[PDB]
């Protein structure tokens, strides 16, 4: 049956040559019947459910057959087989294509020349390829294109048997005259058949390809380009020309990514071919700028292929690319998208990276410094982890290159530590840096051994070298902070088990040297984080390192006391140089009091004493204040950690609660300070404190700690919000990109600090009103924070959320009048946005039913709460409900009259009579 053949290919279960061979025998017995089922197979592969008949075939031309098949198409949707999803339709797409191809290849030695089957098929294909019906035009174009590839395979076979027979003719001439004669007739017969196969190929090409490669439908565009890429590859002698390649050239500029991608894979195929083509030179000279421009394709996948292709070009020829082009490709190792970054990494390796690795390491350093786009090397190292892993892991080569003696500039030494430190991090932590890596992909067995071998080797090499390097560069703050991060990647069992105790001591000394000789904030956090990573109770160096750590803080703590003993005498008016001395030890203490339990030294007093002296006299350098606040904060957390048990105590808590209590009041008055950074610091710690000491400190079976009852006051609740409105929501414009985004992230951090207090009931939820109102104004900056906070408030009290929402709108209403007035134009694009905001707010709405009710029931009270003082008693708040009308849609049908009864308790009978200005009332009630 007609349908039997189509349903076979879709569901062949078959060696498809079996269907083709069975089809071919049906053609030898009767040609007309077999062609009818081939025609009907194409029609049906298009999704058409109609049928072409014998009488239609005999007397009807194809344009008429196609018009009748469109009539009877009898589709149920706009989908056809080639546009369906699912593996059964992708399988069908493959059966379809292979059937066309095996069919032609099996008819290639006889039937294909019978001047009957292939002219029928081709005529049908190109008539359907000309149809406005997309199912037919897309499917025929795919069929013609696969059809055509087969013919290219046939001509390539003919060309090979034409030359084999030429070699058999010259051989028998070179050594009987009735066989040279049978050979020259065989050569002429083969030439005739070549001519017939070129005719068919030319029919498809001029009849289908040159029209359909520029099809309105991009997928049809992509089918043609992929297939011309295939012929040019398979029969390069006949098809690798300017007159076929021009189509690929032009289409590279297509506006659709799928199309541009197929152009590049097609060209990629003509290059791993890689064999001395010169007609490719002319094409690349003309289209090289476009190919380079596609390294920044809007679509990423095309950019990768563009880069990959360009790397082939380098191999094929290299001279072609020119310097500016190469540098544009190099810049992309810094790209956000790793598939681009490592493609450019490969181009960079190939072009300019080709002990031994000593100079290759220097060139990486020179490259990283010459390309001033990134200050660090994390992303440079990750763009090349995959290709040049052999080199980026030669730490011994980098190691003694910073030590054992033109030499190295000082920027280059700093570039090399960061580069080296980056290789170490990516080698120990086998993941890319943030924004490059996958979603917690876990590790192959070989990855895991490679991950444990590297790690020991790092440990063993730099246990010995780390203390030397630190000594040589102890004074540069940039290079110490880097160096100090290596031990957080070491395996510490190796320190003990491999005769290394001497070196650990030698470094721990060099670490206590740097803390003493530095005041940089990063230098000191590195010192504290490493001492933490070395004081792990799982390993046997804890006692050795702990002793050194206890000696370090015995020194700094006793000194700090001595400095405060002098700095705060009543008549010892301290100068700015005495202020740097205090700041230096305080900062060193601060950095260590974060990551280390320093309650044994009881430092609350000193910090307290100074915070209370800056408040009383108001003369106190910001940095002493900021750092004291930090230190105090660390002192209370650490105590609360040791209230883990009460194996500890029952009486110490009264002191701990009092210190949190006073520290809260101290932060609260540093929050109104004039200096921005002091405010942000007091605010930051306050948000953390209030969350830590919330009611939440004991639902998790933590009930012992209830007496730690600090709820924020009404005073602070708003001064906290005052901080947000003055320093988070700021005037908007519309040191270049890098610093502004830093500032945005810190403003986001501060806003989240407060919304955490909202979502967690620390401060009354009414305060979110002045935050929700900024949802559209600050969408890109703070949008995501605002809509997850307001949905968290929704999730905990849906109607309270609605009650705060419309007060947010109520607070954009009285902003609008505050400067302008009560006669303000009520269709302004200011008003219109408040209306749009509300529309979007409405969409947030299952228990939605009373939420929306009181929703309306507060907007109603706000809309007749103040009457017009000199007017018909219109009201002052009449129009505000045009906004609320955007909430009517989400209302219930039953309370869409309970809207009224409540509406009517407020609305006088006289109001509805009046219209002009009163319109907001009319279409508020009309909404209901």
């Amino acid at each position: 049956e007609n349908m039997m053949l189509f349903e076979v290919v879709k569901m062949g279960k078959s060696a498809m040559q079996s269907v083709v061979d069975d089809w071919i025998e049906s053609y030898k017995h009767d040609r007309d019947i077999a062609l009818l089922d081939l025609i009907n197979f194409f029609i049906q592969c298009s999704g058409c459910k109609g049928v072409v008949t014998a009488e239609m075939f005999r007397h009807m031309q194809n344009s008429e057959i196609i018009r009748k098949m469109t009539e009877e198409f009898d589709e149920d949707s706009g989908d056809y087989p080639l546009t369906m999803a699912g593996p059964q339709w992708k399988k069908f797409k493959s059966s379809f294509c292979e059937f066309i191809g095996v069919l032609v290849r099996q008819c290639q030695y006889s039937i294909i020349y019978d001047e009957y089957m292939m002219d029928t098929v081709i005529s049908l294909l190109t008539g359907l390829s000309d149809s406005q019906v997309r199912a037919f035009r897309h499917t025929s174009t795919l069929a013609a294109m696969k059809l055509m590839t087969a013919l290219v395979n046939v001509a390539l076979n003919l060309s090979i048997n034409m030359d084999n027979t030429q070699r058999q003719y010259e051989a028998e001439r070179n050594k009987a005259n009735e066989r040279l004669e049978l050979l020259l007739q065989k050569r002429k017969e083969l030439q005739e058949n070549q001519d017939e196969i070129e005719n068919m190929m030319n029919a498809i090409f001029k009849g289908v390809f040159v029209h359909r490669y520029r099809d309105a439908i991009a997928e049809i565009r992509a089918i043609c380009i992929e297939e011309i890429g295939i012929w040019m590859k398979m029969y390069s002698d006949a098809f690798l020309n300017d007159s076929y390649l021009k189509y690929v050239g032009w289409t590279m500029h297509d506006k659709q990514g799928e199309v541009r991608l197929k152009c590049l894979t097609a060209l990629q195929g003509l290059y791993y071919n890689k064999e001395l083509n010169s007609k490719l030179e002319l094409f690349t000279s003309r289209f090289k700028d476009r190919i380079v421009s596609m390294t920044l394709d809007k679509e990423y996948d095309v950019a990768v292929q563009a880069i990959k292709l360009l790397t082939l070009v380098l191999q094929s020829s290299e001279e072609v690319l020119t310097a500016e082009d190469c540098e544009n490709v190099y810049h992309l190792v810094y790209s956000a998208h790793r598939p681009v970054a490592v493609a450019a990494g490969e181009f960079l390796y190939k072009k300019l990276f080709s002990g031994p690795n000593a100079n290759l390491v220097k060139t990486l350093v020179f490259f990283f410094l010459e390309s001033e786009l990134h200050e660090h090397a994390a992303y440079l190292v990750d763009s090349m982890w995959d290709c040049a892993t052999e080199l980026l892991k030669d730490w011994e080569c980098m190691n003694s290159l910073l030590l054992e003696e033109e030499a190295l500039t000082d920027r280059q030494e700093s570039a090399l530590i960061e580069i080296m430190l980056c290789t170490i991090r990516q080698a120990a932590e086998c993941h890319p840096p943030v924004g490059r890596g996958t979603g917690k992909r876990v590790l192959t067995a070989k990855e895991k051994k490679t991950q444990l071998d590297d790690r020991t080797k790092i440990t063993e090499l730099f246990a010995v070298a780390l203390p030397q390097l630190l000594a040589k560069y102890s004074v540069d703050a940039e290079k110490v902070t880097n160096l100090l991060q290596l031990p957080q990647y070491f395996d510490l069992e190796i320190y003990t088990t491999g005769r290394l105790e001497k070196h650990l001591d030698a470094l721990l000394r060099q670490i206590r040297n740097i803390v003493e000789k530095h005041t940089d904030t990063d230098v000191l956090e590195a010192c504290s984080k490493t001492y933490h990573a070395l004081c792990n109770e799982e390993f046997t160096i804890f006692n050795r390192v702990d002793i050194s750590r206890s000696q370090l803080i015995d020194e700094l703590a006793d000194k700090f006391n001595r400095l405060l003993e002098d700095f705060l005498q009543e008549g010892e008016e301290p100068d700015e140089d005495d202020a740097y001395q205090v700041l230096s030890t305080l900062k060193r203490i601060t950095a260590f009091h974060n990551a280390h339990d320093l309650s044994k030294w009881d430092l609350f007093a000193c910090n307290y004493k100074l915070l209370k002296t800056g408040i009383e006299n108001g003369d106190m350098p910001e940095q002493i204040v900021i750092h004291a606040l930090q230190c105090t904060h660390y002192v209370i957390l650490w105590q609360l950690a040791k209230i883990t048990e009460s194996s500890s105590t029952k009486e110490d808590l009264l002191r701990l609660k009092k210190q949190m209590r006073v520290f809260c009041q101290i932060c609260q008055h540093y929050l109104t300070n004039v200096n921005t950074t002091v405010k942000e610091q007091a605010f930051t710690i306050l948000c953390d404190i209030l969350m830590i000491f919330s009611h939440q400190i004991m639902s998790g079976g933590r009930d012992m700690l209830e007496p730690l009852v600090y709820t924020p006051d009404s005073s602070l609740q708003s001064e906290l919000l005052s901080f947000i409105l003055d320093h988070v929501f700021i005037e908007q414009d519309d040191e270049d990109e890098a610093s502004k985004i830093e500032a945005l992230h810190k403003r986001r951090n501060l806003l989240a600090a407060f919304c955490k207090l909202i979502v967690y009931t620390v401060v009354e939820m009414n305060t979110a009103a002045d935050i929700f109102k900024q949802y559209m104004k600050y969408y890109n900056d703070y949008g995501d924070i605002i809509k997850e906070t307001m949905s968290k408030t929704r999730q905990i009290d849906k109607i309270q959320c609605a009650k705060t929402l419309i007060l947010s709108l109520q607070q954009l209403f009285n902003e609008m009048i505050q400067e302008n007035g009560y006669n303000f134009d009520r269709s302004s694009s200011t008003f219109s946005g408040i209306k749009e905001l509300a529309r979007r707010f409405a969409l947030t709405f299952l228990k939605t039913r009373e939420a929306i009710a009181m929703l309306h029931k507060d907007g109603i009270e706000f809309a007749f709460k103040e009457p017009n003082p000199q007017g018909e008693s219109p009201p002052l708040n009449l129009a505000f409900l045009d906004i609320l009308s955007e909430f009517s849609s989400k209302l219930l049908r039953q309370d869409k009259r309970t809207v009224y009864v409540y509406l009517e308790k407020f609305m006088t009978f006289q109001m509805s009579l009046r219209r002009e200005v009163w319109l907001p009332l009319m279409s508020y009630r009309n909404s209901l």
Binding site: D215, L296, D297, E299, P433, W638, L640, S694, A752, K756
Partner: protein, 74 residues
């Protein structure tokens, strides 16, 4: 009416293709850079609302202090 997709236009004309060839500025873009400072790399790791709502505003470098904040979120 019929759901069968009939295309009124089948081909892009010559002039539009000439236009595509002479202007691709709308299908190329500027380089989206990865975080180019160490601190901008940190703010991408701890940024996004999920991490920001589960981490304190003042960073605590020892898990014991950190835990004291994490424990109090539900």
């Amino acid at each position: 009416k019929r759901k069968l997709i009939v295309d009124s236009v089948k081909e892009l004309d010559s002039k539009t293709i000439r236009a595509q060839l002479s202007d691709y500025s709308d299908i190329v873009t500027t380089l989206d850079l990865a975080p180019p400072t160490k601190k901008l790399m940190m703010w991408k790791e701890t940024g996004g609302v999920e991490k920001l709502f589960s981490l304190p505003a003042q960073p605590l470098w020892n898990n014991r202090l950190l835990k004291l904040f994490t424990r109090c979120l539900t």
